[PDB]
RNA sequence: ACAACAAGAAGACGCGCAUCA
RNA sequence: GACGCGCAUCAUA
């Protein structure tokens, strides 16, 4: 996600697994969050696919209902041949939102 | 002192206050962490943490500030490791998942920052403590500090802790450390599998029950971590397990069964069968057990044994089921929840192998039970079975029983359960076109449920009809579908929005599944009735209504007159205020959907007039709508109106039109080669140093256009924009520099790396530092992509007295 | 910090990169490019009367330390 | 101002030549590779002619080409390593007469680069794994298996990176139903770029490492590291298991060295020189390419020098160790890039510049008048070139 | 002082050591014959009209995505190996339509609103006229 | 036991101006 | 450096 600069990608050797996308983010690009012209399929490394992490969403982490795709611009720029797009950082925004949601109810 | 008072004031600012004050205090403490010092700061922050009456909010802020100050002090926290650990350890046993994960992360960071020997010596006296809670916390700490810095950095310590003879507490703690490392690591212990198996194997024949049980649990954890590979490492462990199966009873028997069940899948087919036979010889007599945890363990063992490919189906159907269906299918099993899920999963995977018919035929009669929980359990069972195996094997004698059972289950309900509707939809879809002779019963039941009992099951009935419209259409039926549609029509005006959304979704599904020209109520009679619904503030009703409006506009447009579309537009301009992304996207799409049918003259004027909201949310949606309508229509009929609006002296309008141009160029793609000349003077004027936002938007436009027009050979006008993009690199704002970098990388593929290299070779070795940093960053960006293409564009550099910088291989002449 | 592509990759420079390092990196890249292509190798082996194996062996030797000794 | 590209003649420069049973029948075929065109051709034992049956353009530089088969299989699958950042597996369908892609795995950026694998490609002779490697810092291993549907599969790549290493050649070592082994000529240069005195450039010998693939452990670990006294160029795989000892042959300047891991000592054998050579004595002698004829009874090797002399290398071995290396002058042919020794005595010579020749092996040179050579002779050898009298020309391309 | 513009760029992929514009067969138009260092001979042919050029461009665009190359290498990226392609249509890709699957050939034909018998004749006419 | 979820509302930034030490 | 105000960016949720 380009909106949040603090997010860090896994950036490892992609395996043969297939990424998944939930209903909240269905047609978004895994890199630039675009909405036009899906091009290729997203692969992830075996570390991101083990036990409870199998079938989870790539960006946020919800249940997987659709496959992840690269847009045409990312394919032209060859940004897909980098690694798995799975985000390993939990994110300071989500935990903080949960923290001031829990106290208020 | 003064420093202590300052730390008191900033700590009070961090603890309580407005978010701006807290973030300012955090940024200043991160800026001045080194100057403040570590000693007094830690001696000041620890007493607040150790207080048992601390609220979670200030505890989280204190942990965050500790994390912020930890990485700045690379080596100054060595003497404070013990005093920080003795306060921070209890945070890894709380039930809060986020708290546990941030505690694990902070302990990993502390282990990385500190040294191995000092912390090892710190935690030496924690092994022999008599408290079990502190031993468990120490085991978790050892696991996380072993995940940090690597396993081999701690491997020799494992031998020392596991070979202790004075007491069994040290050995138990070592085995716990091993199992926690296996659990927390995942599949990263595969290279270090044997080094752990050999050290842990000796504990299976000890005289203490605790050490044997913990060793069995750790072996099970290791087998779980190394699921597909590693039988050669465990080949020396099997025989003690079989020897201990018969001798041990109780908790140790449970641990041994769990371990052996985990190791079964790792073997080959012949060995798997040979050993699962012996496992079953005790499993059959072991199904009878009073404890629920042992029932869960044996269910997991059965699941894992059935999952093995080496066990053939005839043995399964001859042995396992006759006791399974007689012992594990009772009311008490459905009473619990862990047993609920475990039994459901085991039954599903058993049906995946032995056959769906055999499983289903003995549980269809269970749908007539008076208990609601047991009916829910069996309904989930068939729903999951038919989700995977379909309904191609079920026979008519079984199909009618299943239909009767599901109808009985749906007819009476104590509360509202979505599992009933989900299962009914799954069974109906799996049956396909063979549910045709039962359609009138379903229609009568859904009508009866919809017509009465005060809007409690009406929304579920709407969901059911929305799910079954497809099957009723595929079963060659239209008349009762139209009757249901018209019935929903007089049932459209409800006060409750929750049922209104479901009814609107049902109507939308009916419109999707059947033709628009064959709908029983004329299309002209819906939109006047549907327009007041758009003013509702509820989310689901708005979603369903906007989806229905978009579908009608895309499909039914010749019937609808061009008078109410204006009112729909003026209502959608207000509906754009909605928070959810789906509603905004649907409204933006339906703008273009209706402007395809209606000439883009009044639509553009309405959108352009609402570009001065002063709210950022509305302008982005409006400009995306402008882009999508421009893409849908011919771009030459929408450009001059957009350009004429640029002369307004409002900066918001200029930003909006520039963003619309960017989005339009992104959408059209290869069609931008004909209109590239038109926007060149506008981009030239915008790129001038007048404001940062305008330059950023112009850079985005340049990037998108350059990416779109690649492959056509139009660099004559693209090269002119580089002379204006290049001077904008020297900026400090992250957004503008990101936009400029993106524009440069987009232009790199369109113009060729030669021009970029020529531009970069000007001040690559400039005497200053910041310009060198910028140029080197740009050069690295160009170098990562299309590295091979830079060979032919490298400049010639003459060699000096000492070195040879001339590439003589390219000077050969034939 | 999304600069992971620059640090992990080999050959990327920075402010404190000397001229000799850049020159030797580009020389090694040029040698690899010569070796990869076939028509360039044919041109090199036709310009001087040698064999493809001999040219490849010489290119292997020249990759140890080009541009002379460092300063 | 719009042009259109037409092509009249296709490229005829052979770069890589492989042989095997690609169609699945009992007749051998040769898959030659041009710069960017993949071609399939088979010889006719009846009329002694060569005809092309397939020609497809791949639109890219083919940097490597290998063939292999699965355990117990009857068909050969072609593995192609190109300038792109991916590896593909091809299968030939005789009925369709087209190439069908079986698998496609991407592991890096496209284009000829330095740290992108594709230059060196080695396969397990048994057919259980394949290896791909780059010039520097990057090696990758792919494990191949088959499912119950009798279809070839592939697993995730395994990292075998090593910083500051210049790989000269990668070849697979044949073992008998054991962990796969790969031999490479690694070479470090970290110290050579640190000392400005200049002696680091010299006295920097290259090693010969062995890589072990642990199927149970699913990782690759370095086993041994043996420095070499001189510089070598490429390696040859000696068949192992039940047919011959397991080992590799190292070709260098004026010398050939047999080397094996364990208790096997090193054997050094000089290369014979032409009698009354007019060349500069300072010039050395190296090998360009080699072949292998794995006959059921006994196996030998064929090698070619810079001048085109063909030698016949024969290994005499004990129960476990090898005694000596025997060399024998076979014939003289124009310098070629690769040889393909087919069944029924067919020799294919793909010249690097000029026409291509097909030779029929009429005699094996048994009990020849000219003497042989061996490493047991103390102290340099000489031989007299002569007409062929051992191969008969049949077809010319 | 006075720079010169470039009106054509391409990447044959092989080293070229000869260029000559002449007529090959009697009764035909001129062409730019070039020979490479690998043994291939090729010519460059200008179009005769604009509809034919548009049809060739559409065929190339359809076959770029619908018929990917054998080794999984992008055709546009390969032809733009050093410099972007300028006003050149690749005939090697366009002439691969004959070996394509019959159903895919049909789909392409009704995407172009033509017939494979007419497409083959159109493809062969440009080769016959200039060679 | 290592186990991910519900809408009283929040995450990263910047440019300008008033007062005080 | 401290107490404040206004404007504006990221199809931010
Ligand atoms: Zn990953
Ligand atoms: Zn998601
Ligand atoms: Zn993208």
From Swiss-Prot, chain A:
<dbReference type="GO" id="GO:0003723">
    <property type="term" value="F:RNA binding"/>
</dbReference>
<feature type="binding site">
    <location>
        <position position="71"/>
    </location>
    <ligand>
        <name>Zn(2+) 3</name>
    </ligand>
</feature>
<keyword id="KW-0479">Metal-binding</keyword>
<feature type="binding site">
    <location>
        <position position="57"/>
    </location>
    <ligand>
        <name>Zn(2+) 2</name>
    </ligand>
</feature>
<dbReference type="GO" id="GO:0016363">
    <property type="term" value="C:nuclear matrix"/>
</dbReference>
<feature type="modified residue" description="N6-acetyllysine">
    <location>
        <position position="2"/>
    </location>
</feature>
<comment type="subunit">
    <text>Component of the 17S U2 SnRNP complex, a ribonucleoprotein complex that contains small nuclear RNA (snRNA) U2 and a number of specific proteins. Part of the SF3B subcomplex of the 17S U2 SnRNP complex. SF3B associates with the splicing subcomplex SF3A and a 12S RNA unit to form the U2 small nuclear ribonucleoproteins complex (U2 snRNP). Within the SF3B complex interacts directly with SF3B1 and SF3B3. Component of the minor spliceosome, which splices U12-type introns. Within this complex, interacts with CRIPT. Interacts (via N-terminus) with U2AF1 and SRSF5; acts to bridge the two.</text>
</comment>
<feature type="binding site">
    <location>
        <position position="60"/>
    </location>
    <ligand>
        <name>Zn(2+) 2</name>
    </ligand>
</feature>
<keyword id="KW-0805">Transcription regulation</keyword>
<keyword id="KW-0507">mRNA processing</keyword>
<keyword id="KW-0597">Phosphoprotein</keyword>
<feature type="binding site">
    <location>
        <position position="74"/>
    </location>
    <ligand>
        <name>Zn(2+) 3</name>
    </ligand>
</feature>
Swiss-Prot record, chain B:
<comment type="subunit">
    <text>Component of the 17S U2 SnRNP complex, a ribonucleoprotein complex that contains small nuclear RNA (snRNA) U2 and a number of specific proteins. Part of the SF3B subcomplex of the 17S U2 SnRNP complex. SF3B associates with the splicing subcomplex SF3A and a 12S RNA unit to form the U2 small nuclear ribonucleoproteins complex (U2 snRNP). Within the SF3B complex, interacts directly (via HEAT domain) with SF3B3, SF3B5, SF3B6 and (via HEAT domain) with PHF5A. The SF3B subcomplex interacts with U2AF2. Identified in the spliceosome C complex.</text>
</comment>
<protein>
    <recommendedName>
        <fullName>Splicing factor 3B subunit 1</fullName>
    </recommendedName>
</protein>
<dbReference type="GO" id="GO:0045945">
    <property type="term" value="P:positive regulation of transcription by RNA polymerase III"/>
</dbReference>
<feature type="region of interest" description="Interaction with SF3B3 and SF3B5">
    <location>
        <begin position="758"/>
        <end position="814"/>
    </location>
</feature>
<dbReference type="GO" id="GO:0034693">
    <property type="term" value="C:U11/U12 snRNP"/>
</dbReference>
<dbReference type="GO" id="GO:0005634">
    <property type="term" value="C:nucleus"/>
</dbReference>
<dbReference type="GO" id="GO:0071013">
    <property type="term" value="C:catalytic step 2 spliceosome"/>
</dbReference>
<dbReference type="GO" id="GO:1990935">
    <property type="term" value="F:splicing factor binding"/>
</dbReference>
<dbReference type="GO" id="GO:0008380">
    <property type="term" value="P:RNA splicing"/>
</dbReference>
<feature type="repeat" description="HEAT 1">
    <location>
        <begin position="39"/>
        <end position="78"/>
    </location>
</feature>
<feature type="repeat" description="HEAT 6">
    <location>
        <begin position="273"/>
        <end position="311"/>
    </location>
</feature>
<keyword id="KW-0597">Phosphoprotein</keyword>
UniProtKB/Swiss-Prot annotation, chain C:
<dbReference type="GO" id="GO:0071005">
    <property type="term" value="C:U2-type precatalytic spliceosome"/>
</dbReference>
<keyword id="KW-0597">Phosphoprotein</keyword>
<comment type="function">
    <text>Component of the 17S U2 SnRNP complex of the spliceosome, a large ribonucleoprotein complex that removes introns from transcribed pre-mRNAs. The 17S U2 SnRNP complex (1) directly participates in early spliceosome assembly and (2) mediates recognition of the intron branch site during pre-mRNA splicing by promoting the selection of the pre-mRNA branch-site adenosine, the nucleophile for the first step of splicing.</text>
</comment>
<dbReference type="GO" id="GO:0005689">
    <property type="term" value="C:U12-type spliceosomal complex"/>
</dbReference>
<dbReference type="GO" id="GO:0005684">
    <property type="term" value="C:U2-type spliceosomal complex"/>
</dbReference>
<keyword id="KW-0539">Nucleus</keyword>
<dbReference type="GO" id="GO:0005681">
    <property type="term" value="C:spliceosomal complex"/>
</dbReference>
<keyword id="KW-0508">mRNA splicing</keyword>
<keyword id="KW-0007">Acetylation</keyword>
<dbReference type="GO" id="GO:0071011">
    <property type="term" value="C:precatalytic spliceosome"/>
</dbReference>
<keyword id="KW-0747">Spliceosome</keyword>
<dbReference type="GO" id="GO:0000398">
    <property type="term" value="P:mRNA splicing, via spliceosome"/>
</dbReference>
Curated annotation (Swiss-Prot), chain E:
<feature type="region of interest" description="Interaction with SF3B5">
    <location>
        <begin position="15"/>
        <end position="38"/>
    </location>
</feature>
<feature type="modified residue" description="Phosphothreonine">
    <location>
        <position position="115"/>
    </location>
</feature>
<comment type="similarity">
    <text>Belongs to the RSE1 family.</text>
</comment>
<comment type="function">
    <text>Component of the 17S U2 SnRNP complex of the spliceosome, a large ribonucleoprotein complex that removes introns from transcribed pre-mRNAs. The 17S U2 SnRNP complex (1) directly participates in early spliceosome assembly and (2) mediates recognition of the intron branch site during pre-mRNA splicing by promoting the selection of the pre-mRNA branch-site adenosine, the nucleophile for the first step of splicing.</text>
</comment>
<comment type="subunit">
    <text>Component of the 17S U2 SnRNP complex, a ribonucleoprotein complex that contains small nuclear RNA (snRNA) U2 and a number of specific proteins. Part of the SF3B subcomplex of the 17S U2 SnRNP complex. SF3B associates with the splicing subcomplex SF3A and a 12S RNA unit to form the U2 small nuclear ribonucleoproteins complex (U2 snRNP). Within the SF3B subcomplex, interacts directly with SF3B1 (via HEAT domain), SF3B5 and PHF5A. Identified in the spliceosome A complex; remains associated with the spliceosome throughout the splicing process. Component of the spliceosome B complex.</text>
</comment>
<feature type="site" description="Interaction with SF3B1">
    <location>
        <position position="86"/>
    </location>
</feature>
<protein>
    <recommendedName>
        <fullName>Splicing factor 3B subunit 3</fullName>
    </recommendedName>
</protein>
